[model samples]
Target: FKCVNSLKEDHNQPLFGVQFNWHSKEGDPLVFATVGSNRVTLYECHSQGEIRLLQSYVDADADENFYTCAWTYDSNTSHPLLAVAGSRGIIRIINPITMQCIKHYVGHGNAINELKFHPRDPNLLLSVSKDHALRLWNIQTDTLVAIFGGVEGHRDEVLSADYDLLGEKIMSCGMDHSLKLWRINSKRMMNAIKESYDYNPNKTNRPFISQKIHFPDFSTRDIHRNYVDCVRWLGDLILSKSCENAIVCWKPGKMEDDIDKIKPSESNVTILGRFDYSQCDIWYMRFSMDFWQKMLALGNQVGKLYVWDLEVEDPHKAKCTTLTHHKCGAAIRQTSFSRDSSILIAVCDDASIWRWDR
Candidate 1:
């Protein structure tokens, strides 16, 4: 069953991830995780102002196990694709509408914790795991591109990364609260600051990344009140989630003073843009933020969808739009406004897809 008026479905289990794509003018589609059943569902959407459920399926073999899903679209070819990761460590590339399996790429040894669609190329993507390595892959060819992280690499599970809009650079974050940068042209990491090289005093011929004196680190502390779930780039700001009430926007380089502030005001609706929450038994099912609209949307321990607009005059208020909480699928990982702002697609725990129109 789907919602003809409201923007949600029945409550139901823990949802792992979600995303939307508008590759065709006919319309875009919403893709989300059906955690309990190992399914990924797609919904029809239009730019006018609302969203609707149109298709659903399991991308893997009928008897195989699958759990999480993340999606993106290729701007060049307008192809909408989904990356489904599970306990088996293989990443399945599938077409949401056709339910056809494309390529199965290995992610990590344990349950793959994170997956992201490359902003530039839909065929290119990033996958990280408990195995302590972040691997770049070309889903179209099902081959591993670049491997990063280890004792000598990113200290922990690589959480997230995406190429800049220009496709020349990629920014990444990990469990260690480190924000890193890598250059695509040279396939080398670009330091946030310009620095000169220096010889290692303790070594004969070894040279380390020479950092300039008093250079503020280009990394931001990705502290999610708990473990950081995911992060996205917001223009010059970095919007992130790690715990309850933990959405922060940081300037390009890591600066301790990169915080939101407000001017004294007498306005009545003074909403501060902060994810203010007290820790409870609430296990946050899914999390997401969209930079284009300057809005952050998250489902709580209960069933409330907390939305906070970043441009608020105050940084501590919430502009919440609440709905009757669902059992599970209602917990949203990703949601967005249609190109024309007519369709709204929301995923819930019951594994049902719902939509609404203006």
Candidate 2:
């Protein structure tokens, strides 16, 4: 991907979130963002490769500023639905075509940090919050079906999450120092450990099996014992970036009888592959999971963007480009990519938005 243009916001606060309409066969996949304060803007992509603003709106309260936004993935629905959340700790489902607020989702006591619609189910939603909880919501009824974090969940705020390709599970990253995968079925799954087994005392900074374990909470115990910043699923495969300088690829597996001797090199249960960025601090990443479009976009704290060809499974092949327009050490907070993966938008901590021909 290469930078096409950079868009600056008038507000001085950092721009933290961005997202695209998932299925837009009826029209162009619209891109949207939450500006510094209580403002959100919609943009349309043109044939000339220019992104133009279609609409902009602000909340009435001077103190209410949006922090995150998500576009509906429903294909059968004619009109589009967008979920915009903010500092006010409220979520509004809006019809961007008409610039009308259709419904509101209110439950989180703190800000809604991130949200995404279920891959296969249009009415289902997953929302994470600063309040240390991830909620599963039914959009049609505007009701909460279940909560993922409470007594045995992430110790800190949940940053973000994505549904599995089957839409039967979800993986969540958090400030709690780990990335956890949850079964989104009848209940969040848990495994039983017999008192006879020795606890896994071995550990590694290197990547381990990308495998799903019987014990999901045991995930962050080894690989990147620091904060697991983000997680995204490519089909059934999982990719995660922890605060440490590594991106781990994971696979699912059955709990072993000898659970104490797990290694990062073991292929049976834990890790699959890794992308190491010891020199640069990664701030954001997005996956172009389509078979023909197997690419990965990564932005670091130093305003540099890297595009990786995931098909080759080699990090050394990444194409690097600098967001020279930004000052030193500005972290790219989030990125949004169009359905076809030809267009991309990146938002950085400097309150600036950049476009790229992906």
Candidate 3:
């Protein structure tokens, strides 16, 4: 029922992930990473949704760009900061204004799967990789501070990882299909708080806050037919998707009534995963920050994007909407929103980036 700006495909390769962030003096910038080819392209958008290409980098130049980049906000600095994870387990410290990378960090043994800034510190970012590892990166220092994996078992390849309100604890899930809790020894610096209150007693001089991260055992049987591919945290809710033509809503604990909870649906496709364009593995998904309420965005293998509304918190009866008119061809692989939820971006399998705004 809501109309927003969308960018149609102009290429043959499909998009893998879409990201949005603000540049120093450029306002907001849109970015998306591709799969068939190694490319991360940036775009500038007007109020009317007219996107003009600002920058484009290739796979060989991944050392300077993204394989599948995600972003975070740095209120400590005047401009915004970007944390990009790509193939080969590397993270590119990006400055969109200059269209050049600041530093490259290596952590995971596998390809970098996702990027998310600590809810509190822009300098503190978390990365998940297929290498069965979840690690934190220091953007300013350009080094890894800590790593988490095999704590429970050895073969847990993390697919999706995100921080809660304070970034005190982390939630990650993957090949294990079971979500895990990670303790990031992040020094929760109240940089903005300090800037706000210059004069306060010892009560306000806490440069770093130490909080024990929480990993609550929570999940539901209801999800896509195949494996879970993507995840995004929005307030009290977690939005996730799968390759089996499904999108799901997840949380850390049981937050619903027993009668209205989601029950796992039976999947029909076991084979023919090719012609049906369904996922043989996992499906990627995200939530729009700029969008109000509990709306989610997801992309499948076949080039389709779905925006679902779980405002009711009742999964069984929640409103799920599909947002594509393509009669053929797959469109996007993933979607994301900015820190303030002002910009919405999606990367399609067709090697194109879709920029949308409220």
Report the poorest 10 consecutive residues by lDDT, candidate 3. 266-275
What digit string (tens of lDDT, one per residue) describes model 2 on residues 207-285? 2111122334324445557666677776555677776666777654443323323332333445667766533454333
Give the Å error, residue 146, model 2: 0.7
> What does candidate 1's lDDT look like per residue over 1-358, in tens digits?
1234344433344345555543444632433334334556565544443445655555345433455566766445667666777657778777766877666775366656667666655666667665666666655434455665534355666665655565554556656655555444342322211111122235445333322221111334434434455566655445556645556554442233322221112111211134554332333344555535555665554445555565655444536554443443334544444444444445555444445443
lDDT of 2 at 137: 70
| TM-score: model 1 vs. ground truth | 0.67
The TM-scores, one per candidate, come to 0.67, 0.78, 0.70
Candidate 3 lDDT, 89-186, residue by residue in tens: 77776665664666777646478767777766677777888777777656554445556654452255667778767675566767555555443433
Best-to-worst lDDT order: 2, 3, 1
lDDT of 3 at 77: 68
- TM-score: which is higher, 2 or 3? 2
Model 3, runs deviating above 4 Å: 1-11, 22-36, 59-66, 73-76, 151-154, 185-226, 234-237, 250-293, 313-317, 337-343, 355-358
> What do the candidate models score in CA lDDT, each in turn?
0.51, 0.64, 0.53
Error of 3 at 350 (Å): 1.6
Candidate 1 colliding pairs, count = 32
| Candidate 3 TM-score versus the reference | 0.70
Winning model by TM-score:
2
